[PDB]
Amino acid sequence: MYKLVLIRHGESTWNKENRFTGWVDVDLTEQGNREARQAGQLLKEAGYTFDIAYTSVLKRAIRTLWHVQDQMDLMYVPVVHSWRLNERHYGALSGLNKAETAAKYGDEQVLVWRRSYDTPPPALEPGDERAPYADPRYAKVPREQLPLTECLKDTVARVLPLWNESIAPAVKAGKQVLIAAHGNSLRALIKYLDGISDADIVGLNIPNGVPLVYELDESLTPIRHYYLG
Amino acid sequence: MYKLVLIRHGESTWNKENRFTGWVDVDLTEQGNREARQAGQLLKEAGYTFDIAYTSVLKRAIRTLWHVQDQMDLMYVPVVHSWRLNERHYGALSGLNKAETAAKYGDEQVLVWRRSYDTPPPALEPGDERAPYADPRYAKVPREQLPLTECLKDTVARVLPLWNESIAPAVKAGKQVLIAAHGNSLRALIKYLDGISDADIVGLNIPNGVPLVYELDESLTPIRHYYLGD
Ligand SMILES: O=C(O)[C@@H](COP(=O)(O)O)OP(=O)(O)O
């Protein structure tokens, strides 16, 4: 029996502005901060603890983690910040208002761009300011592994090495893990963990700032899962 | 040539209350939060960046780091939190007001507790609430290595292994390192770095929340150091 807690970052600015975010490094709203703080308080009160946490390199997730740590009195635990946990990359949609985009390209198109397992949004041009190449966060990521766009499928491919190489061993080592990540990177990981089919994942949505608890057996096969609070 | 930036945590509740803190895990005051923020801005404006940061397991140091990372847009960097960077353990003095303590045991006595390199304050009882043993922060540290009190000499000895095993290799590795820690634990590191005598370390005081830049030669020998700011 292992427990693993997932939590999606609190409400970000672009969440609130209903803008596609992906790799753009936007921060938490005040509400996002509340949610993160409330999640940490929830975890504290339910008596949960952590020996390690995993996060992306995007401040909305890390700041959420911070608030969780702050509330749980766990600011001292090792935190692994991984670009592998990054939100799904939204290519040339990053920054665009979702309502405006669906008005322009149709809801269907947008729904494909948002939830197609295998078909990514349109890509960033390699020369877009928003491309990841010159970002210090990715300085050690081999260029050809940095996306200009992603579908969930890419996200799953990107997350898995972090799971296999780091999180799973941490869990089996008996470390109590928190993963603070993103809507679609958590969908990606959860797709893997729950062995969810390509069609079945399409409808999964994870609210901001709600601890999602996984109980895992000795082979790390999910037993059940549940949100806290 | 390398640069290493050191910063003592911003003002803490017990800094303001003039209380020996030690391993008591008190938080930053609002002033302390602002010092931490300002130090970040100052480093950001100076064009400083970091690849890795080292800190203690004490939130006053860690929150300072957070504010720095926040202001510098480096919330994603690896942070090693090590008990080895903890503030010097203050023993049975922890939580006591320094002024009343002086008023009771004498200025000399207090100053020997506070700045004598080799004489520790009086120890915590092993049964004291404040003893470290049940603390998850220290769960993997051998009991015998956990202090009930420390003089600076203990602090040095406690710090050096992190320096040798980890921070020095980072610096040699070409990593740009920030260490966010405490007055005495930095006094201890600096003693080693600058090769300050037992007598001389006595006067060294390190202000809250001010970046202290060391420029190190190839052999990690300080060439110069300066505070950033005023
Ligand atoms: O232990 C403490 O009270 C102070 C040092 O106090 P003095 O020994 O300098 O009085 O440490 P910090 O606030 O930097 O963590």
Numbering used by the authors:
A (entry chain B): 1 to 229
B (entry chain A): 1 to 230
From the paper:
The enzyme 2,3-bisphosphoglycerate-dependent phosphoglycerate mutase (PGAM) catalyzes the interconversion of 3-phosphoglycerate and 2-phosphoglycerate, a key step in the glycolytic pathway. PGAM converts 3-phosphoglycerate to 2-phosphoglycerate through a ping-pong mechanism in which a phosphoenzyme transfers a phosphate group from an active-site histidine to 3-phosphoglycerate to form a 2,3-bisphosphoglycerate intermediate that subsequently transfers the phosphate from the 3-position to yield the 2-phospho­glycerate product and a reconstituted phosphoenzyme. As a key enzyme in glycolysis and energy metabolism, PGAM is a potential target for novel antibiotics. Here, we present six X-ray crystal structures of an additional Gram-negative bacterial PGAM from Burkholderia pseudomallei bound to various ligands.
